[PDB]
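Re: the multi-chain job from yesterday

Posting the exact lines I submitted so nobody has to dig through the queue logs.
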Amino acid sequence: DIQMTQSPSSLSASVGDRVTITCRASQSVSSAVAWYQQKPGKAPKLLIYSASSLYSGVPSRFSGSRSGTDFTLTISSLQPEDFATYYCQQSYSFPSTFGQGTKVEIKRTVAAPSVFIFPPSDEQLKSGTASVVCLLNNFYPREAKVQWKVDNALQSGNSQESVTEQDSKDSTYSLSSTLTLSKADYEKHKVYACEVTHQGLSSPVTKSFNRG
Amino acid sequence: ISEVQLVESGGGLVQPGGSLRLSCAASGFYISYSSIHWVRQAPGKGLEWVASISPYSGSTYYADSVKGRFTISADTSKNTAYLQMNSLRAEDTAVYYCARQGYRRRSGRGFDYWGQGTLVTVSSASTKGPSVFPLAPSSKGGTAALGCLVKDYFPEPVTVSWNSGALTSGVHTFPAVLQSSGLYSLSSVVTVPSSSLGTQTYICNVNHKPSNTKVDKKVEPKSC
RNA sequence: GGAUGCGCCUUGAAAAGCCUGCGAAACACGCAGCUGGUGAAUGACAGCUAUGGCGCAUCC
Ligand SMILES: CN1/C(=C/c2sc3ccccc3[n+]2CCCS(=O)(=O)O)Oc2ccccc21
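And the result, structure tokens for all chains:
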């Protein structure tokens, strides 16, 4: 089987940067190589075919090049909507094989999150569980620390986080942290707080509410 | 006119060891004169080519990880390609895409059209619909945030829209998380102007197809 | 929508094999002719006729 290996596997570049992604075939493939762009959860979109031909409708900042068994996708000047995973593919011999993908992230300036806290609904409380949600909206970089406190005691092991894909216009992230408690435990305590630490904040930001 | 389209169907939850077939219904071209490929993507992982069928001859090709268990075929009368999967294993769980290899003259051997993709989950677990709870805006950056929590469903996916699709600005629908219960949950939030909380209505439309759950939950502030 | 005009593609290489262009065309199937060039085993072709397409420009 022919193997395709891209380098790097992930990269972060600023708007306007020249980005180059490389892909190496283990055996000869004679420029039967295509490049695709894939947004998260969406079908891939063809960018380059026959190693170096720009597909109809693809912006001119994308180009492809061949040198022996090494193939290069170039983005001449990176745009915020170019955040994606890029894949090479050989179609010289069956079975066809894709590269492992290179994830391209847009590096931007630091942006501090806006923090919101959400108590459980009475509707959910009827069910015996309470979910407390903390929202971190429109921040950069991705790294952030969310700490839950219940009556000033630090929580551990009872929260989970999810983070959106990078925004296509402002390159920021949003993050949710969900604290899961039994109704019993929720009703035993008063102050529910999420404390957020992030590069864009001079000191941690705490959002809280009092049950009832 | 007939625009080129690939519409996949047949995805869902299936027990291991069984059989499941995916369909790829083509519009706008004659499927037996084109090359059709199946490509899959396990959650969080890379694209994996799975199989293909050649124009005019109908010759079929398969990846080793799949050969002998899957069969790709085409039906001219239905203009539809198929991926028959047998002896399903957990490693087969993935979003499956069908794709058309384009016209040599215009795009070489690149895949120029793709289906929307459909999730096949190979699991022994059972189907559970979600509960939808409001995330109410608070009484206190100039704007307000609100949302809905979609908790305890299986398998993926769920779709969420706001105001039947009229509200898209400021919406963030987070990736689902797998809870320790083995069920999924996710939140969808949107930021809106505080001044409009009394006037504008905000409804979160949640659809979980594998359980025929359609919910519309209004989100208003608490009286307090 | 109608006229005209321009351009382009409609292979190349031959015993075999391999490579390659076109035909919706990776395997299987199909691809007429002329002049020159090339090949002592080498894709290396140039300009065209014919037949099928495709794009651009002018004009009513
Ligand atoms: C058959 N054969 C061969 C013939 C050759 S070499 C050559 C070189 C210059 C001019 C003519 C020419 N010719 C014949 C032309 C007839 S034609 O093919 O044009 O009809 O050379 C071979 C070398 C190895 C194995 C078989 C071989």
